[PDB]
Amino acid sequence: RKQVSDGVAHIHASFNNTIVTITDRQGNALGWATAGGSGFRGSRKSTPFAAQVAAERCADAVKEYGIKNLEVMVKGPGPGRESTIRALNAAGFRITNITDVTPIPHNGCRPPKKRRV
């Protein structure tokens, strides 16, 4: 494994899950961890506490690449919108940037129909 000094965190938060992917600055994944793969299932995996171990198990998987600076690109809404980046400072990482990359259409395609629950 070629030791790369820095990288980007991609935190794909949705209302049911959170996928954390540490990559480099060119877009090549180094390791990942999700909220449902943490031993969490159904309703437990869509909490803000379930998405910090997604960032902890992912920081624990990129220890051999030796990453010091790590900016964050947050995509999507969710309960782990905030607590996934709180626990990425706890792995000793100085934040470089924080980006918001939610895709916004300018009224393109038609979204699905309303739920009559």
């Binding site: 809404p77 905030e82 100085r94 940037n97 924080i98 918001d100 916004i104 038609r110 979204p111 739920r115």
Partner: protein, 70 residues
């Protein structure tokens, strides 16, 4: 809300500054609105109910301030 963190500045000062720039851009308010389709009837019916909400709180509640409560 593309934020760079400035030199000699902690993480909480960049975290709370990120909880501000995502509300001026309307990021959370855009995603919940485009989650389901709203009809051209439904989009125009709520656009008038809020104009009644803004104007019947402005002019029709000042009456209790012209009068008194105790």
């Amino acid at each position: 809300p593309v934020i760079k963190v400035r030199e000699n500045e902690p993480f909480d000062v960049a975290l709370r500054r990120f909880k501000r720039s995502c509300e001026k851009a309307g990021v959370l308010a855009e995603v919940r609105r485009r989650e389901f389709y709203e009809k051209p009837t439904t989009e125009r019916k709520r656009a008038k109910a809020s104009a009644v909400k803004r104007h019947a709180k402005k002019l029709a509640r000042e009456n209790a301030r012209r009068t008194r409560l105790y």
